[PDB]
Design a protein around this ligand. Sequence first.
Ligand SMILES: [Mg+2]
Ligand SMILES: [Mg+2]
Ligand SMILES: [Mg+2]
Ligand SMILES: [Mg+2]
Ligand SMILES: [Mg+2]
Ligand SMILES: [Mg+2]
Ligand SMILES: [Mg+2]
Ligand SMILES: [Mg+2]
Ligand SMILES: [Mg+2]
Ligand SMILES: [Mg+2]
Ligand SMILES: [Mg+2]
Ligand SMILES: [Mg+2]
Ligand SMILES: [Mg+2]
Ligand SMILES: [Mg+2]
Ligand SMILES: [Mg+2]
Ligand SMILES: [Mg+2]
Ligand SMILES: [Mg+2]
Ligand SMILES: [Mg+2]
Ligand SMILES: [Mg+2]
Ligand SMILES: [Mg+2]
Ligand SMILES: [Mg+2]
Ligand SMILES: [Mg+2]
Ligand SMILES: [Mg+2]
Ligand SMILES: [Mg+2]
Ligand SMILES: [Mg+2]
Lengths: 155, 141, 135, 204
Amino acid sequence: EFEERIVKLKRISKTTKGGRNMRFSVLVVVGNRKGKIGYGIAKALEVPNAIKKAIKAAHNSLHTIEIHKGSIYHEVIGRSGASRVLLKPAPQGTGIIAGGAIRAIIELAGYSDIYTKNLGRNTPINMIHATMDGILKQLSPRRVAILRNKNLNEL
Amino acid sequence: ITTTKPIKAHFDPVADLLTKINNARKAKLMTVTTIASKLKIAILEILVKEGYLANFQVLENKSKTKRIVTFNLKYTQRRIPSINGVKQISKPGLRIYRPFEKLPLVLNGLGIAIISTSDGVMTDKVARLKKIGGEILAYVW
Amino acid sequence: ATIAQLIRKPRKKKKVKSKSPALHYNLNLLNKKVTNVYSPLKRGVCTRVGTMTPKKPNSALRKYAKVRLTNGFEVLTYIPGEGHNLQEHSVTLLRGGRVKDLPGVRYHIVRGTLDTVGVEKRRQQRSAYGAKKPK
Amino acid sequence: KYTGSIFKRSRRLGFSLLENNKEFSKGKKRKTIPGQHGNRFRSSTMSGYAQQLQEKQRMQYMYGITDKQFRRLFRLVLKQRGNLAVNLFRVLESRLDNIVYRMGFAPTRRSARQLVNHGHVLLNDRTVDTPSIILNPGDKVRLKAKTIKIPIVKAASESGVVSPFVETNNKTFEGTYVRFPERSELPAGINESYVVEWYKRLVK
RNA sequence: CAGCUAGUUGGUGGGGUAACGGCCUACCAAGGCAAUGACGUGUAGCUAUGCUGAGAAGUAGAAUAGCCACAAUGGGACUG
RNA sequence: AUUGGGCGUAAAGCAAGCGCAGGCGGAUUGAAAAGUCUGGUGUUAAAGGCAGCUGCUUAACAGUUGUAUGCAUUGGAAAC
RNA sequence: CAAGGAUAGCACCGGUGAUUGGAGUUAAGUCGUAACAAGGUACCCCUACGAGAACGUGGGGGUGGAUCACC
RNA sequence: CUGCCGAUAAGGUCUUCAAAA
Ligand SMILES: [Mg+2]
Ligand SMILES: [Mg+2]
Ligand SMILES: [Mg+2]
Ligand SMILES: [Mg+2]
Ligand SMILES: [Mg+2]
Ligand SMILES: [Mg+2]
Ligand SMILES: [Mg+2]
Ligand SMILES: [Mg+2]
Ligand SMILES: [Mg+2]
Ligand SMILES: [Mg+2]
Ligand SMILES: [Mg+2]
Ligand SMILES: [Mg+2]
Ligand SMILES: [Mg+2]
Ligand SMILES: [Mg+2]
Ligand SMILES: [Mg+2]
Ligand SMILES: [Mg+2]
Ligand SMILES: [Mg+2]
Ligand SMILES: [Mg+2]
Ligand SMILES: [Mg+2]
Ligand SMILES: [Mg+2]
Ligand SMILES: [Mg+2]
Ligand SMILES: [Mg+2]
Ligand SMILES: [Mg+2]
Ligand SMILES: [Mg+2]
Ligand SMILES: [Mg+2]
């Protein structure tokens, strides 16, 4: 049940020797709402073929996501170009306080409570890039234990 | 132990060590050297207790007039470090003093915060245990 | 910049200017001083009625007016509606606005309030133009 | 103060007051959005704002509420302890006129409001005229006696069809209520929780 | 808005004030403040607080409450 | 943009240098304790703020108890 | 002792003013064609003079210049 | 192998849409 939601449908065009070749570009986010989420951008002469190719690309590149108590473990800033997205842990109940492309990514990943603010640009591809970068740099409290030789997070 | 190169260090003592650690991590280098100071010596002792570096040896010259500390980083088998990011709080000029009620928690306790309250440098958790705060040196996670 | 630099010269905020300055000037007349007190809408008297041409895209004949408010400021205010009773010498109750076609006009005349008549033959969005409910 | 075309608004959203009495009807069995522009394309892909506003209306039209009243109740429930997702559901279902209809003593919800406004209902130890009192499970909301004889009591006294969260002690018309309504008694007409977040942006 | 301040800075004896005090007096001196912003210009009752903001804070000093100032304008004094 | 921004090509590195005051600043030892942290006491008027409760048919509202912030003094800590 | 009055010359601030300077804004006005390609004389910066006007030339400075080229 | 070579009135379409098969 990998649900998918369009996050942007732009109208790109090149110029030839007379006229304008117009192709639709779609940005689809696919997520199983259990820890797997990917993004795919595709271009085609028509929306249906563009959507099919974008979903195919998105399903080809699926990253693995870990959730802690339904939220994000530690506050993180994802950077991608000039877009910086701040994610902050939230108590169980606030809901997803995100909006736009980031909100779509968080819902499709599985996370519930999440504090976000877009501190940079409003271009959907870079915000999604920043969101995925922020979520992928996250450190579990068990990897640092193997690293720092602590006691499975114990004080 | 002998050397061949001259050893220099920056005038600001927290970020000098911080720059050494960060550059070595990014460049995959392991063994680095710097001049030894007691504040720098104490912060390295708590770091090895927290398990971010492997060994930390302070040395002295044959005349007892100079000391240089040469530390190495703790890389795993696949060669990825334990330190992820370092950031200094009480920079020169603007010194950061926070009371106990505002003692920070770095990455929900995953990282360690260095606080030298009254008994030398001290970790955030034990600072909370004693309910006493003070100078905050740097964030390490 | 730097902590020391900002200590010497702090951060000065950019200012803010109004869009209808002439509506916030009050002349006392007994002392002849102008103080800056904001007021939503103000009464004036027209001096010259006529028509103006819009900027570039638009093409039409828009009815302007040179109305002098209870203060001493002369502002060109558009008569918002189809048909007017202005007769070069009359009293009007201006409001805020900014027509984009005519450069310089930044006020609108509240219709159907004082000497200016309402806009009859209007059944849609009347509450704004001022027409008695058909009933 | 309410609309007088409940068929139209129920037909638009698509969900009636849970008996499909306003959807079945005796004519044409119409299940299209009202107006001339009802049998058109562009059905799905409602924006997040669009579906949220449509859903918000569903919650506040099921009970005949004004949005300002909704904002007051949300501001009330918001502050307390934590994830209060069990409290505001009880709060929204605690309306006095709503309980009389779930009591089975009224043909319709807004008709029950009319009887409440006219003074034909009582409470554990006082009388109630305003159809907005927030009730708490445990009050013996006993019915009137001079209204048990009115020419409309027949279907009123047929409360044998009643929700399990409104216990009446049948034939005694005591009509208390315990065992707060679970989501099962709150059907899929409006069963969502991001309407709370919609009011979180609009209402602090 | 770069100099301002001649009772302005200090001492002496005396007078006056509920009281200390150039507050006033006679004499003796030449100091005081100022680039860490004097002085000048413009503006404004101050505060607890109101609205807004995740916060740091921004904004107005409704009502009311504390303090100050005023009573057509400018001075003086009696009674207490 | 202290928290929380930038200055090669988009606004922004003075043409360059000698440089006082200011800011910052090698290592070790001793003392003091001005910053820094902490304990005790006083105070920070009442209303308002947040939490709980009561009373008005519930609410709005009113009352009720709780609820900080800073300053001063005193007693310790000595890492910077 | 002293409000106020009269006389006197400086200081700061405001309004207005014949006439005049430039500026912005304007669907379809007149004289050129200076810049963007090697823009048809490469461009740009500082400076001096000159001309209806864009601008021309002299001095210095830059590549944020085309062509050119090398097995 | 460097003659000469100046101008071109105003405002304007055109992407409807993927819900899906
Ligand atoms: Mg061609
Ligand atoms: Mg003296
Ligand atoms: Mg005043
Ligand atoms: Mg903010
Ligand atoms: Mg007041
Ligand atoms: Mg007042
Ligand atoms: Mg910027
Ligand atoms: Mg530049
Ligand atoms: Mg330079
Ligand atoms: Mg320069
Ligand atoms: Mg030098
Ligand atoms: Mg110096
Ligand atoms: Mg030192
Ligand atoms: Mg108080
Ligand atoms: Mg009250
Ligand atoms: Mg011409
Ligand atoms: Mg040319
Ligand atoms: Mg030519
Ligand atoms: Mg040329
Ligand atoms: Mg001529
Ligand atoms: Mg010439
Ligand atoms: Mg030249
Ligand atoms: Mg030249
Ligand atoms: Mg040069
Ligand atoms: Mg020719």
